[PDB]
Design a protein around this ligand. Structure first.
Ligand SMILES: Cc1cc(CCCCCCCOc2ccc(C3=NCCO3)cc2)on1
Ligand SMILES: Cc1cc(CCCCCCCOc2ccc(C3=NCCO3)cc2)on1
Lengths: 40, 255, 273, 236, 273, 59, 40, 40, 59, 57
C-alpha cells in the first residue's frame, strides 16, 4: 500500500533479476564459441 | 528359529557371526546412505572404493579388570591406519562415512558385569585444567589405541573422569545417545549402525572426528571364584557407504 | 485423545512388562499394561514444550557498558569505554546456554532487543539525552578505532541509532556458514599441533560495536547496554545429556577443578524415604 | 493521517511476546539445509527415552556406584531401596527426566520405572516393587508395601522389568518443585523370596534402575531451572 | 419484555401469597399476585450485573516499593529494597477480596497493569529515568538474591521491562492447578497435626519480583509499584453470604476479637420508622 | 509507514476499559474444566433468594 | 480482530445472558406450584 | 499480515505438532513388539 | 480513534530498513531517461569480467 | 538451477580451455570443462548483490 502520492516516496525497488554479463564479458563483434578455436 | 540373538553381518570380504546378540541399534533410526546431489556443494565427482574400504577392521583388544574405568575411541581416527581406508583418508581433502560398530565381550554364566556401549555425535572433550585450557590435537587423536579413562591426566590432554562423560554431563544420561548394554548374563556383543551426522555435507577426516564410541563398565566385572579376574573386550568397526573427494598430495598431521 | 483406556484383569502368556534394556530401546509401557485402568482423556497437546516455544523467548545474552565523556587526551578510546565492542557469541551468559546445549546442531533466526539505561554516579545538573549507535561489524571489516572514526559512517554495514532508556529491535536471518550452528564441535580449524579446540573456531560471526553519538556535556554519563536474544524459526537436531557441572569458558566444555558433587547425598540409607 | 490512541503497555518489552521486526540484513540468502538424522520437535519426545537414576545416593562424592543398587544373597522379607517420588529433587533430579521437568512448573502423567538385573546368569531372585499413592507413609515392611500398586518381578532370561507409576491424583497437576498438597507417593522394593547365587560365586549383585515418562505425560508453565547459575559472565 | 402484566380484582381459592418457607424455596411472587397492576415493560437487560462485568474492571491488588541507590556495601539487597518480591496473591488489598469471596470457586484469566512512579524525597538535581524489570518467579525457581544476579537473565521466565512513570500491561492465562481457584478451602495439605489451614496451602502461584535496571546516580530514587488486576473470561460457582466482619489475614477467614456490632442499632423502637 | 495522529487520552490507564494484551505465558494449556453444581451468571440471579432481616435491631 | 495468538489475551467476555435463579430459589425435590398449597 | 519483506522478520513459527519419539526410544534394527519376548 | 500499542524498537533508525517517506518536492517531474549503453544490474555481472593479478608482488 | 552438471572423462579435438585473451572477451569456462564433476544445485539467487541493494542502505 503506498500512503503517499509521489513515486519517489515508495520503498526500495525489488530485484532486477535481470543479469546479463555478456555486454561486459563478451563484447566481441564476431561470436566466439567455447571449444572452437579462438583464432581461425 | 530366527532369534534376535544370532546374527551375521557380511561387509566386503569380512563376516562376523554372533550367537548372543541383543538386537542392534541404528542411530536415530537411519541407515548409512551416500550423499545426494540435492545436498551436495563441492563440484568434484567423489570416489567410492566400496569393498576395499567397507570391510571390518578389528582394533587391538582391551582388558576389563575390576579397576577399569572405560575407554573412548574417536571416528574416523580409530581407523586412520587401517588398510586402504586410511590411505584414502590422508590422500583426499574431504571424505564421508557411516560405520557398523561391533563390540565383543564373552564370559560364562557365573560372571557378572555390564558395559554401556554408546556413540556420541560431536563429543567435544573438556581440558582437566579448567578455565579455557584447550585439549591438544594429539590428545584427541589417539588412533586405534583410543583413550583410556583410567590413565592419568596428561598436559594438553582431556579430563578422564567417568561420572562426567569427559565434558560436564552425567554418566547416567548418556542413555539419550544411541547405545546398547553388554550384560554378561544376557548379551556378549553390542552392534550399532552409525549414519553420517554432520552440519556440512562432507568434511575433513583429519581435523574433525564426528563420533566417539565409548565402552564403560557400569556394573563392575565379578568373576567366579578363583577365576582370573579379567576379560578382554574387542572392538571391530567397518566403514560403510564411504566416499572420498578432493584428491591430491596427502595430508601431514601433527605428531 | 485418550490418556488411558479402560483395561481389566489379565492372566496371559503375553507379558508386556518384561523386556531386555540391553537392546537400547525404551519399550512403550503404559499404566494399563500392569494395573486395571478406566478411560480418561488427555485434554492437552504439548504445545509449550515445542522447541520453537522452548527457545523462543528473549534471554539476556550480554551486558556491556560505554561512557560519554570528554575524549580530549584519551589515547585509547576503546580502553576508556568511549565505545566498546562485543565479540558476538551466545554462550556467555549461562541460562540460555544450558537450554541450547540440550541439542548438538541448532538453526534459527535471531531477534535482538537492546535496552540501554543511563547512570550518573557523580554529581550532574541533569540527565542528558544520548543516542546510542550500535553497528554490526563482521569479520574482515575495518574496525573502529576511535569513537568517531570513518568506520561509524557504516555505509555498507547495518547500524541502528536509538535513545538511551529506549530499546532497539531488529532481527537477523540465520547467518551460519553451514546448514546449522554447531553447539559442539570435536575438531580443529586445521591439523595444527597447537591450534585451539572446540566451537570458538567455528563461531565466528564477528562482533558488534556500540558508541554514544553525543559529544560530551560537563558531567560524565555511564550507559550500560543489555542485549537480549530470541530464537525464531527454530530447528534442533540430536538431543544430548544436560549440562551438570558449572561452565568456565565460552566455547569449551571444560568444568572447574575440585567442583562439588552434583548428585545430592541421601540423609539416610538407600532404604530411606 | 488516521487518528489513534495508545494503550497502557505501549513501549514495554515483554521477553515472551512474538512480533515482526525489520531484518538488519535485507536480502541475504541463508545456507541451504541438508538432511541431518535426529531432529527433535518436542521436549515430550525426549523425556520418553529412559536414563539411569543414581538411586544409591549414599556416597559422599559423585561416583559410578551410586547408579548401582546392591542386592544381598539369602536375605528374606527385607527391603532393597526406598525413595519418595519428588521427580524434581533427590534421586530423580539429575536424570534427563528430572532435568527437563525442572524447566516447567507443573507436571501430570504416568512414570515408567524399570530395573535391569546384572547378576550371574545361574542365579535367581524374586523381588516386589511397590508404588504407595499419596496419603500413607513410605511402607515399613512388605506387608505394608504389598497393599498398594506392586509387581512381583521374577528374574529370568528377560533381564528388565518395567513398573509404571500410574497417575493417582485428585488435583490434575502437581508441582515439579516438591510441595506437600501436591505430593506423589513413595516407591519401595523388597525381596519376594530372595536372591540365590550359584556355586563358585560370591558377593553382591547389582540392579541398574531407569526412569522415563509415559506418553500420558504433560508439563506446563515454563520457568528457569535451579540447576544452573553463575557469578560473572564467561569469556573466551 | 413485560415487567408487570395487567391484573384485576381476585376472589379465589388459589392463593399464591401463602407459602411454607420451611421448604427452602423462595416462591416467585409478583406485585400482580396481590394488588391490581397495569402493564409496564422492563426496558432493561441486567447487563452490568453479569459476573464478567462485576469482576471485570482493574482493581489495585498490591503496592510495593524498591529504590535505586549505591549497593556498595549492602549485605542484603532484598532488605535494602534494592529489589523486592511479592508472594503473589489476590486477597491482600481488601476491596476486590470481598467481591471475589461472594463465590466459592472462580476461574478467569488475569490482565495485570503495573504503574510505577518515582519519588525523590531528598535533594536531587534531577529526576533520573529508570527502567523497572518485573519478572515472574514461580515455585521451585531460582530466586534472585542480589539486584543483579544471574536470575535476572530470565532466559526461561517471562519478564517485562518498562519505564518508571509508564505502565506495563500483559495478561496471564488461568494458571490454577485445579479446574477453578478455591476462594475457600476447608482442608489441609496433608493430615499433619500442626499443618496450616485454609486457602494459603492451595494458592501457591509463586511470586513476582521487581528491580530497577539502572545503576545508581548521585541521589537516591524511590520507585513505588502498584499492581492492578482485571479478571477476563470469568466463571464463578456457588454463591455465599457476603463478608460482614473485617479481615485480619491473607487466606484465613479469621476476624478480629472485640470487633464492633455490624448490625446498626435502631435509634428507637422496633416500631420506629 | 502509515501516517497516524494520536488523540487526547493516549497513554491513559482507565480501570474500566476492555482491550487485548499480549499473554506472558505463550502456549500454556489451562486445566480442563470439570462440572461443578452452582454456577452464577448474574448478581440478579442471587438477589432473588430470600434471606432473613435483623428487624429487631434494638439490641 | 484478535491481534494475539493466545485466548487469554482477548478482551472481556460478553454477557452470559444465561440467568436461571431456580437452582438457588427453588432447589426443592418435588415441584411447588405457586397458588397450590405449599404443604398438602 | 507480514509487514516486512524478508522471512527472518516474521514472528515465531507455530507448533511442529510433529512428535515421533521412536527415533530416540526404539532405534532397534529388528522391530520389537510389546508383549512378545524381548530376546527369542 | 483506533486503539494501538507501540512495540520495542519504536523510534529507532536502522540504516537497512526500507519504508515509505513523504516527498519533499511534491509533484516534481524528473528528467526523462534516455538510453545509455552499459547498464549494470548485479555485482555478479561484473565479477565475471577478468582483470590482471599483480602476481609478481615482490617489488 | 544447476551449479555444476555431471561430466566425465574427455579426449577431444574440442578444447574449451584454450582461448585468446587478446580479443577482449572472458570466455565462460566452468569446472566441468576441465575436471570430472557431479551435479550440484545453486540454492542461491544473487539477491543481495543487486545494485538496488548495494546502494540502498
Ligand atoms: C551455539 C551457538 C549458536 C550460535 C549462533 C550465534 C549467531 C548469532 C550472531 C549473529 C547475529 O548477527 C547480527 C546481525 C545484525 C546485527 C546488528 N544489526 C544492526 C545492529 O546489530 C548484529 C548481529 O552461537 N552459538
Ligand atoms: C481467590 C483467589 C483466586 C486467585 C488467583 C490468583 C492467581 C493470580 C496469580 C497468577 C498470576 O501469574 C502471573 C503470570 C505472569 C506474570 C508476569 N509476567 C511478566 C511479569 O509478571 C505474573 C504473574 O487467587 N486467590
Amino acid at each position: 500500500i503506498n500512503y503517499y502520492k509521489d513515486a519517489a516516496s515508495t520503498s526500495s525497488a525489488g530485484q532486477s533479476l535481470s543479469m546479463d554479463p555478456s555486454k561486459f564479458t563478451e563484447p566481441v563483434k564476431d561470436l566466439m564459441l567455447k571449444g572452437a578455436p579462438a583464432l581461425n | 528359529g530366527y532369534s534376535d540373538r544370532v546374527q551375521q553381518i557380511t561387509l566386503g570380504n569380512s563376516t562376523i557371526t554372533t550367537q548372543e546378540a541383543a538386537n542392534a541399534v541404528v542411530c536415530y533410526a537411519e541407515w548409512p546412505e551416500y550423499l545426494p546431489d540435492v545436498d551436495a556443494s563441492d563440484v568434484n565427482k567423489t570416489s567410492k572404493p566400496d569393498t576395499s574400504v567397507c570391510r571390518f577392521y578389528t582394533l587391538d583388544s582391551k582388558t576389563w579388570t575390576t579397576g577399569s574405568k572405560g575407554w573412548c575411541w574417536k571416528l574416523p581416527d580409530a581407523l586412520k591406519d587401517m588398510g586402504v581406508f586410511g590411505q584414502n583418508m590422508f590422500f583426499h581433502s574431504l571424505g564421508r562415512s557411516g560405520y557398523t560398530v561391533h563390540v565383543q565381550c564373552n564370559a560364562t554364566k557365573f560372571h557378572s558385569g555390564c558395559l554401556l556401549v554408546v556413540v556420541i555425535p560431536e563429543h567435544q572433550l573438556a581440558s582437566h585444567e579448567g578455565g579455557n585450557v584447550s585439549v591438544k590435537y594429539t590428545f584427541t587423536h589417539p588412533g586405534e589405541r583410543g583413550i583410556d579413562l583410567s590413565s592419568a591426566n596428561e598436559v594438553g590432554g582431556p579430563v578422564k573422569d567417568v561420572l562426567y562423560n569427559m565434558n560436564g554431563t552425567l554418566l547416567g544420561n548418556l542413555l539419550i545417545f544411541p547405545h546398547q548394554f553388554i550384560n554378561l548374563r544376557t548379551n556378549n556383543t553390542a552392534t550399532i549402525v552409525i549414519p553420517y551426522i554432520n552440519s556440512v555435507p562432507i568434511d575433513s577426516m583429519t581435523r574433525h572426528n564426528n563420533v566417539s564410541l565409548m565402552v564403560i563398565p557400569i556394573a563392575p566385572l565379578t568373576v567366579p571364584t578363583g577365576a582370573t579376574p579379567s576379560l578382554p573386550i574387542t572392538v571391530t568397526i567397518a566403514p560403510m557407504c564411504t566416499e572420498f573427494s578432493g584428491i591430491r598430495s596427502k595430508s601431514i598431521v601433527p605428531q | 485423545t485418550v490418556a488411558s483406556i479402560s483395561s481389566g484383569p489379565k492372566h496371559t502368556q503375553k507379558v508386556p512388562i518384561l523386556t531386555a534394556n540391553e537392546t537400547g530401546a525404551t519399550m512403550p509401557v503404559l499404566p494399563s499394561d500392569s494395573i486395571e485402568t478406566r478411560t480418561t482423556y488427555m485434554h492437552f497437546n504439548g504445545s509449550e514444550t515445542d522447541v520453537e516455544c522452548f527457545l523462543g523467548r528473549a534471554a539476556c545474552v550480554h551486558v556491556t557498558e560505554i561512557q560519554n565523556k570528554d575524549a580530549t587526551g584519551i589515547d585509547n578510546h576503546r580502553e576508556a569505554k568511549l565505545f566498546n565492542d562485543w565479540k558476538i557469541n551466545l554462550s556467555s551468559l549461562v541460562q540460555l546456554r544450558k537450554k541450547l546445549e540440550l541439542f548438538t546442531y541448532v538453526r534459527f533466526d535471531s531477534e535482538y532487543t537492546i535496552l540501554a539505561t543511563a547512570s550518573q554516579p557523580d554529581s550532574a545538573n541533569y540527565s542528558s539525552n544520548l543516542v546510542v549507535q550500535a553497528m554490526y561489524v563482521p569479520p574482515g571489516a575495518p574496525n573502529p578505532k576511535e569513537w568517531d572514526d570513518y568506520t561509524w559512517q557504516s555505509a555498507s554495514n547495518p547500524s541502528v541509532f536509538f535513545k538511551v532508556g529506549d530499546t532497539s529491535r531488529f532481527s537477523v536471518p540465520y547467518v551460519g556458514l553451514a546448514s546449522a550452528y554447531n553447539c559442539f564441535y570435536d575438531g580443529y580449524s586445521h591439523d595444527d599441533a597447537e591450534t585451539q579446540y572446540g566451537i570458538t573456531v567455528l563461531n565466528h560471526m564477528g562482533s558488534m560495536a556500540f558508541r554514544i553519538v553525543n559529544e560530551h556535556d560537563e558531567h560524565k554519563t555511564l550507559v550500560k547496554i543489555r542485549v537480549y536474544h530470541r530464537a525464531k524459526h527454530v530447528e534442533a537436531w540430536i538431543p544430548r545429556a544436560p549440562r551438570a557441572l558449572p561452565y568456565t569458558s565460552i566455547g569449551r566444555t571444560n568444568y572447574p577443578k575440585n567442583t562439588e558433587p552434583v548428585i545430592k547425598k541421601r540423609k539416610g540409607d538407600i532404604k530411606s524415604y | 493521517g488516521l487518528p489513534t490512541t495508545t494503550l497502557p503497555g505501549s513501549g514495554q518489552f515483554l521477553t515472551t511476546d512474538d512480533r515482526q521486526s525489520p531484518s538488519a540484513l535485507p536480502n541475504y540468502e541463508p545456507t541451504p539445509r541438508i538432511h541431518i538424522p535426529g531432529k527433535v520437535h518436542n521436549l515430550l519426545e525426549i523425556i520418553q527415552v529412559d536414563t539411569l537414576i543414581p538411586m544409591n545416593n549414599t556416597h559422599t562424592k559423585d561416583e559410578v556406584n551410586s547408579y548401582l543398587i546392591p542386592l544381598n544373597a539369602n536375605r528374606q522379607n527385607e527391603q532393597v531401596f526406598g525413595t519418595n517420588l519428588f521427580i524434581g529433587d533427590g534421586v530423580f533430579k539429575t536424570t534427563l527426566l528430572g532435568e527437563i521437568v525442572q524447566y516447567y512448573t507443573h507436571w501430570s502423567g504416568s512414570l515408567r520405572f524399570s530395573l535391569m538385573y546384572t547378576g550371574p546368569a545361574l542365579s535367581s531372585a524374586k523381588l516386589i516393587l511397590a508404588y504407595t499413592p499419596p496419603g500413607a507413609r513410605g511402607p515399613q515392611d512388605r506387608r505394608e508395601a504389598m497393599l498398594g500398586t506392586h509387581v512381583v518381578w521374577d528374574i529370568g532370561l528377560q533381564s528388565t522389568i518395567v513398573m509404571t507409576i500410574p497417575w493417582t491424583s485428585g488435583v490434575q497437576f502437581r508441582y515439579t518443585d516438591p510441595d506437600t498438597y501436591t505430593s506423589a507417593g513413595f516407591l519401595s522394593c523388597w525381596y519376594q523370596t530372595s536372591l540365590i547365587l550359584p556355586p563358585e560365586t560370591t558377593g553382591q549383585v547389582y540392579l541398574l534402575s531407569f526412569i522415563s515418562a509415559c506418553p500420558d505425560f504433560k508439563l506446563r508453565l515454563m520457568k528457569d531451572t535451579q540447576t544452573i547459575s553463575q557469578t560473572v559472565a564467561l569469556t573466551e
